[PDB]
């Protein structure tokens, strides 16, 4: 009896079976729908890859905004498609592990648990805290995690396997944001990216040529003095555009949210702020165990930069360490897979019997 | 807290998808290719050590970390967790064996291949540090693996020996024997520089090993060798001393290392390092000296070694090397 593992991201759905080293299926957390005849058997809803490749007859919607589920009906579309189309299993036959965001509201956990039991008739289920999974994935149970993905960035202090809620930090600036911003600057550059179809082009330019400068001002200078920083990117029509300083200005946003109109501080300040919210005792451990996770932490150079900045906020002595797993696009999923493969989970599950007696509430006492 | 180690302890060993108990009579020994969990009750709370062997896979390590937490939970979460990676065991965890050495075999249960088979003929590098803490790490049975500064054990169902290097200290002498008993056979106590023709045969090759006037000095326990990490990754040059026992892992492929064996200083350049890093390392190596406690022997040679091409006088300072490691 194999268990299913599901990491519902704001922009990506990573799903697979417990035990496997990687998601079997990764696809956009998007559900499309006619923008108002077509053929016959007119589909009220298309999802994921398929809702992207098209887009012309739609709206394209996002059940999860900033880590939280907000469009439940559409979310169910995501869970069904996950279950019946990508993984190709029947939910009643497998225990299911779902992931959630750090401060997910007690109301959401319930809905989630209710849906999984009343709508998919699952045998058992469980919900884990994303960042914590990524920490396990690295073999730690203490340390502060940086989880920046497509819709949010989190600073999540973990001590002995438990997140410290008073110390968590949520920053609604991440993947998508940086992409869109890259379109703005490139457009100001002279090239023109505005169309949604072009949004995806830019996304690839973002994942392939952007980087974080060690010293933004110097880089700015160098980019303006020579052309050593410039890169050529061939568009689909064959036209070759050159992106220069915008290579680092894009993710520079992380450290200076000021660049996209946000009031918030930078990911290095929030980390410091967070660490300082925790007992003075475990702060050393925290600084030595900065574990990065999420697609937006993949920019070449962010690790070192992150080290620089915190080194200047932390006390003169503190040893700073930034762990940056290569596999970090899937920490959450990996850890979840491993956690659900452990024989000890069997007992940790929320069985349907239990759900029938106690109801949704049970998730608060059973998971935590 | 901190006591003897004489206390009651429970040791597990994350095998496949379960933490399976470890024969109490072998507590001391560990498989460097697996991850363990150990519950120890002081002599006055408790503490759990999550020991992650150097060659254990993520699935194990990940598993071992989760079970450490789940155990902590199960016991009301009063015990203290403590993650220790191979080679960096704390003084205390190191004492959980009445004074016996901590033995570390090659392999372990790669669950989808099970427990690996011992050997056919094997060798151990038995080293100890300032505080007597001793380790017996299994290494390939090759001549080129010996180190004039330690004691080794060569078990070879055909025969078996207890080679003792010039600079080998008592602690390593002792723990060298303990390892022999532990798994079975009587030596042929042989010292370095006066060894039988059939010891060289167990290793099947010739010799020419890890040695140097410093390695052969049994007074090293005065100015122990030190490893420094020199990186400019943050925008300024900084040097950090490398705590714990010098291991091949400790060498930052990313930067430039300083291995100061007092009578000499190796500047180890990481493959992906930076020229500016090497330069400043040298500038510093040359300045660590001169600021010399005049205890600082004349004009110490500074030597430069590139990643993958380190000489025996360098590698003999790392607890168990691995020609194939960065490849
Ligand atoms: N090499 C790369 N560089 C920069 N960003 C990347 C790279 N690869 C992926 N990303 C970004 O990661 C984001 C998706 O990864 P992730 O799995 O973290 O999304 P998510 O989990 O849905 O986001 P969140 O957890 O915020 O809800 C996308 O915005 C994508 O651009
Ligand atoms: Ca996520
Ligand atoms: Ca505890
Ligand atoms: Ca193993
Ligand atoms: Ca020695
Ligand atoms: Ca470097």
């Amino acid at each position: 009896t194999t268990a299913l593992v599901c990491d519902n991201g704001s922009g990506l759905v990573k799903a697979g079976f417990a035990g496997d080293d990687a998601p079997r299926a990764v696809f956009p957390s998007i559900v499309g729908r006619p923008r108002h005849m077509v053929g016959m058997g007119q589909k009220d809803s298309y999802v994921g890859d398929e809702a992207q490749s098209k887009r012309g007859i739609l709206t394209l919607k996002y059940p999860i905004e900033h880590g939280i589920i907000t469009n439940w009906d559409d979310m169910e579309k995501i869970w069904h498609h996950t279950f019946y189309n990508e993984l190709r299993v029947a939910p009643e036959e497998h225990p299911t592990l779902l992931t959630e965001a750090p401060l997910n509201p007690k109301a959401n956990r319930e809905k989630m648990t209710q849906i999984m039991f009343e709508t998919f008739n699952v045998p058992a289920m469980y919900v884990a805290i994303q960042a914590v999974l990524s920490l396990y994935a690295s073999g730690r149970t203490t340390g502060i995690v940086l989880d920046s993905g497509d819709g949010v960035t989190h600073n999540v202090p973990i001590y002995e396997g438990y997140a410290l809620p008073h110390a968590i930090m949520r920053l609604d600036l991440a993947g998508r944001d940086l992409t869109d911003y890259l379109m703005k600057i490139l457009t100001e550059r002279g090239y023109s990216f505005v169309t949604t179809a072009e949004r995806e082009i830019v996304r690839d330019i973002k994942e392939k040529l952007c980087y974080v400068a060690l010293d933004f001002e110097n880089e700015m200078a160098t980019a303006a003095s020579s052309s050593s920083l410039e890169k050529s990117y061939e568009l689909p029509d064959g036209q070759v555009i050159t992106i220069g300083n915008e290579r680092f200005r894009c993710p520079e946003t992380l450290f200076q949210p000021s660049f996209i109109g946000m009031e918030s501080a930078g990911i290095h300040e929030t980390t410091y702020n967070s660490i300082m919210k925790c007992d003075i005792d475990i702060r050393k451990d925290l600084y030595a165990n900065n574990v990065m996770s999420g697609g937006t932490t993949m920019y070449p150079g962010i690790a070192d930069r992150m080290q620089k900045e915190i080194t200047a906020l932390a006390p003169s002595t503190m040893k700073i360490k930034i762990i940056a797993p290569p596999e970090r696009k899937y920490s959450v999923w990996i850890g979840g897979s491993i956690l659900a493969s452990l024989s000890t989970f069997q007992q940790m599950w929320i069985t349907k019997q239990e759900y029938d007696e106690a109801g949704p509430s049970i998730v608060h006492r059973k998971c935590f | 807290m901190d006591d003897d180690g004489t206390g009651q302890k429970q040791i597990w060993r994350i095998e496949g998808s379960n933490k399976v108990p470890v024969d109490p009579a072998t507590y001391g020994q560990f498989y460097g290719g697996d991850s363990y969990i150990i519950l120890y009750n002081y002599r006055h709370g408790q503490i759990i050590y999550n020991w992650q062997g150097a060659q254990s896979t993520q699935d194990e390590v990940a598993a071992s970390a989760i079970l450490t937490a789940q155990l902590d939970e199960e016991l009301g979460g009063t015990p203290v967790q403590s993650r220790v990676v191979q080679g960096k065991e704390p003084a205390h965890l190191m004492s959980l064996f009445g004074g016996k050495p901590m033995i570390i075999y090659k392999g372990g249960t790669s669950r989808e291949g099970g427990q690996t088979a011992p050997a056919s003929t094997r060798l151990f590098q038995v080293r100890a540090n300032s505080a007597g803490a001793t380790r017996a790490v299994e290494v390939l049975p090759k001549a080129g693996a010996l180190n004039s500064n330690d004691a080794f054990v060569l078990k070879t169902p055909s025969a078996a020996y207890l080679w003792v290097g010039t600079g080998a200290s008592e602690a390593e002498k002792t723990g060298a024997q303990e390892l022999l008993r532990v798994l079975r056979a009587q030596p042929v106590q042989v010292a370095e520089g006066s060894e039988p023709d059939g010891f060289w045969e167990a290793l099947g090759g010739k010799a020419a090993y890890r040695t140097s006037p410093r390695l052969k000095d049994k007074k090293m326990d005065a100015h122990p060798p030190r490893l420094f990490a020199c990186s400019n990754k943050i925008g300024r040059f900084v040097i950090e001393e490398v705590p714990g026992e010098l291991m091949q892992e400790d060498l930052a492929t990313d930067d430039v290392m300083l291995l100061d064996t007092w009578d000499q200083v190796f500047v180890w350049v990481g493959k992906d390092s930076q020229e500016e890093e090497k330069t400043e390392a040298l500038t510093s190596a040359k300045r660590y000296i001169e600021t010399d406690p005049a205890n600082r022997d004349r004009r110490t040679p500074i030597t430069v070694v590139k990643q993958g091409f380190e000489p025996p006088s360098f590698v003999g300072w790392f607890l168990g090397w691995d020609d194939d490691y960065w490849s």
Side-chain angles (χ1 to χ4, degrees), chain A residues 1-49 51-368, chain B:
Chain A
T1 305
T2 294
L4 309 172
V5 170
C6 247
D7 173 24
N8 300 115
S10 290
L12 290 188
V13 171
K14 285 69 70 165
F17 302 95
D20 292 331
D21 326 279
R24 195 189 231 71
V26 179
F27 63 90
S29 233
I30 57 174
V31 182
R33 283 164 118 152
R35 5 148 5 157
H36 256 287
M37 153 156 146
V38 145
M40 305 281 232
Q42 205 192 110
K43 43 249 100 83
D44 82 66
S45 317
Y46 225 77
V47 169
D49 289 307
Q52 262 276 297
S53 277
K54 283 138 190 100
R55 226 205 105 68
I57 0 81
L58 69 156
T59 46
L60 279 219
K61 238 163 175 173
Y62 285 89
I64 297 178
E65 309 164 2
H66 310 292
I68 276 108
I69 289 172
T70 55
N71 190 332
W72 297 97
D73 279 309
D74 284 293
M75 184 69 236
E76 298 186 18
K77 255 76 111 174
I78 299 287
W79 281 328
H80 182 279
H81 180 266
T82 290
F83 280 154
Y84 290 104
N85 296 165
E86 294 286 333
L87 294 179
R88 263 151 277 136
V89 296
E92 329 93 57
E93 281 157 36
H94 319 293
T96 297
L97 198 215
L98 300 181
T99 78
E100 68 190 325
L103 301 159
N104 197 30
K106 297 219 306 172
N108 290 57
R109 319 165 62 74
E110 283 185 40
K111 195 66 172 189
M112 192 177 322
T113 347
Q114 166 166 290
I115 291 196
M116 283 283 132
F117 280 124
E118 313 186 347
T119 303
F120 294 86
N121 185 195
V122 260
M125 71 109 54
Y126 194 101
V127 187
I129 297 63
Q130 286 154 36
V132 180
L133 287 181
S134 278
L135 192 58
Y136 289 159
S138 81
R140 295 160 223 274
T141 64
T142 291
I144 182 171
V145 178
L146 174 65
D147 200 0
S148 173
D150 192 58
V152 281
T153 292
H154 277 102
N155 287 107
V156 192
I158 303 174
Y159 180 65
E160 304 215 306
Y162 288 121
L164 312 180
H166 61 297
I168 301 185
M169 300 279 141
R170 178 168 169 294
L171 189 221
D172 300 287
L173 138 63
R176 253 183 281 163
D177 283 54
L178 268 27
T179 285
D180 289 329
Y181 179 60
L182 181 58
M183 311 201 286
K184 186 183 200 275
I185 81 185
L186 274 206
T187 277
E188 289 162 7
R189 178 51 64 188
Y191 315 101
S192 182
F193 303 82
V194 173
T195 273
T196 352
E198 300 178 347
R199 183 164 278 90
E200 280 297 286
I201 310 193
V202 183
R203 197 177 62 60
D204 193 55
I205 297 174
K206 187 187 76 171
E207 317 193 331
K208 295 177 68 176
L209 298 171
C210 281
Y211 70 88
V212 175
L214 219 199
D215 189 292
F216 186 68
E217 302 302 314
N218 299 312
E219 284 269 331
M220 256 340 223
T222 303
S225 58
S226 68
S227 60
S228 29
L229 273 35
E230 300 183 354
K231 288 295 177 177
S232 295
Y233 184 93
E234 184 191 317
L235 295 173
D237 56 20
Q239 207 63 238
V240 170
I241 56 160
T242 125
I243 89 268
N245 69 4
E246 33 261 334
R247 280 180 61 197
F248 53 97
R249 276 150 54 55
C250 177
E252 174 65 25
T253 300
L254 262 350
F255 300 89
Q256 297 183 66
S258 142
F259 290 8
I260 44 176
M262 280 197 69
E263 173 173 281
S264 176
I267 65 175
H268 61 306
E269 294 222 41
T270 54
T271 307
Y272 172 69
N273 287 174
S274 179
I275 287 178
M276 280 286 115
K277 226 130 200 180
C278 306
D279 267 49
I280 137 193
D281 299 10
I282 68 179
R283 306 221 260 249
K284 262 189 187 189
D285 283 356
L286 264 9
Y287 284 112
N289 297 262
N290 253 280
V291 173
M292 297 225 291
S293 103
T296 286
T297 67
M298 291 299 305
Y299 291 98
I302 187 174
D304 287 356
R305 176 77 130 93
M306 194 66 178
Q307 195 178 29
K308 182 177 170 196
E309 296 298 340
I310 286 173
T311 285
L313 291 168
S316 54
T317 39
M318 272 308 167
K319 186 165 194 183
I320 301 286
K321 264 252 295 173
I322 283 94
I323 297 80
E327 8 124 353
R328 68 188 100 117
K329 280 198 197 183
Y330 309 101
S331 305
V332 167
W333 184 93
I334 294 193
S337 179
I338 294 158
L339 162 69
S341 269
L342 292 190
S343 68
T344 60
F345 209 57
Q346 274 175 276
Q347 254 3 73
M348 291 179 21
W349 288 117
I350 300 183
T351 77
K352 174 125 186 211
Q353 182 192 315
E354 306 183 325
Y355 173 75
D356 288 350
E357 319 205 324
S361 333
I362 210 165
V363 72
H364 305 295
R365 75 177 221 233
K366 266 277 186 169
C367 294
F368 73 90
Chain B
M1 311 180 269
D2 253 336
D3 70 21
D4 308 75
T6 50
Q8 304 250 216
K9 68 182 175 262
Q10 215 317 64
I11 297 179
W12 289 271
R13 179 255 208 139
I14 284 77
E15 310 222 319
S17 158
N18 282 277
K19 80 177 111 162
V20 320
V22 165
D23 187 354
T26 80
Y27 271 8
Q29 11 303 331
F30 290 90
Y31 276 104
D34 289 327
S35 307
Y36 294 58
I37 287 180
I38 146 165
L39 172 19
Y40 172 89
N41 285 76
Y42 290 94
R43 267 251 255 155
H44 85 305
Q46 339 171 82
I47 172 188
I48 300 130
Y49 281 121
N50 177 201
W51 190 88
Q52 282 154 30
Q55 317 112 215
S56 167
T57 34
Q58 169 164 37
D59 61 309
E60 295 178 319
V61 202
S64 92
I66 300 181
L67 293 162
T68 300
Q70 283 171 10
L71 174 51
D72 190 349
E73 190 186 54
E74 166 174 335
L75 281 49
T78 57
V80 184
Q81 282 178 49
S82 175
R83 168 182 169 272
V84 325
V85 325
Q86 195 183 320
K88 311 297 185 174
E89 303 80 341
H92 180 122
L93 161 67
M94 214 52 203
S95 61
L96 273 36
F97 312 110
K100 285 58 197 78
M102 176 174 168
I103 301 170
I104 300 174
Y105 313 129
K106 281 199 160 297
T109 66
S110 48
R111 198 28 161 4
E112 290 11 311
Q115 190 67 87
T116 8
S120 60
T121 180
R122 42 202 270 180
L123 167 61
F124 295 59
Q125 185 199 326
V126 186
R127 177 197 247 99
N129 64 52
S130 309
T134 305
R135 297 186 175 72
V137 178
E138 187 167 316
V139 195
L140 302 136
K142 282 162 52 185
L146 282 75
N147 155 337
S148 311
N149 187 274
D150 298 325
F152 289 53
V153 162
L154 216 179
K155 162 138 159 184
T156 171
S158 220
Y161 315 82
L162 194 176
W163 190 96
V164 45
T166 294
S169 74
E170 286 286 294
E172 291 150 62
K173 299 168 92 81
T174 263
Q177 287 179 166
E178 282 292 356
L179 172 264
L180 279 163
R181 302 171 208 189
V182 146
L183 253 197
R184 296 302 172 174
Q186 291 297 259
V188 179
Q189 310 262 312
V190 37
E192 169 183 42
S194 38
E195 44 279 293
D197 286 274
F199 158 109
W200 290 125
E201 282 196 71
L203 306 181
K206 265 173 73 190
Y209 50 99
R210 316 198 197 298
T211 179
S212 74
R214 182 54 175 175
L215 280 177
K216 282 181 178 174
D217 193 67
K218 48 182 67 249
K219 316 124 183 176
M220 183 148 60
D221 304 59
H223 273 304
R226 291 162 69 182
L227 190 61
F228 303 88
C230 317
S231 176
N232 77 163
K233 70 167 67 174
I234 73 164
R236 24 184 248 60
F237 187 67
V238 308
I239 309 191
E240 270 176 34
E241 174 147 35
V242 177
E245 284 214 347
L246 317 169
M247 308 194 80
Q248 178 171 48
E249 229 288 342
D250 297 318
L251 300 180
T253 224
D254 253 55
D255 309 306
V256 179
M257 293 320 231
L258 265 324
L259 204 213
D260 164 34
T261 78
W262 195 258
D263 78 329
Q264 162 179 48
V265 178
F266 291 99
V267 359
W268 186 92
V269 309
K271 175 199 173 174
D272 303 317
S273 74
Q274 222 154 272
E275 196 61 38
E276 292 77 11
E277 283 176 319
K278 193 191 158 177
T279 298
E280 276 225 63
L282 259 182
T283 274
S284 287
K286 183 178 172 181
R287 197 156 36 201
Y288 182 18
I289 315 172
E290 284 188 44
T291 310
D292 109 289
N295 225 359
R296 218 10 147 123
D297 58 298
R298 316 101 205 285
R299 265 332 150 255
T300 345
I302 292 183
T303 309
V304 175
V305 345
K306 288 176 61 180
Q307 183 187 314
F309 299 77
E310 35 288 281
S313 84
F314 179 81
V315 222
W317 292 108
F318 294 67
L319 185 58
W321 193 256
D322 185 347
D323 306 56
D324 306 289
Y325 179 97
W326 299 302
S327 314

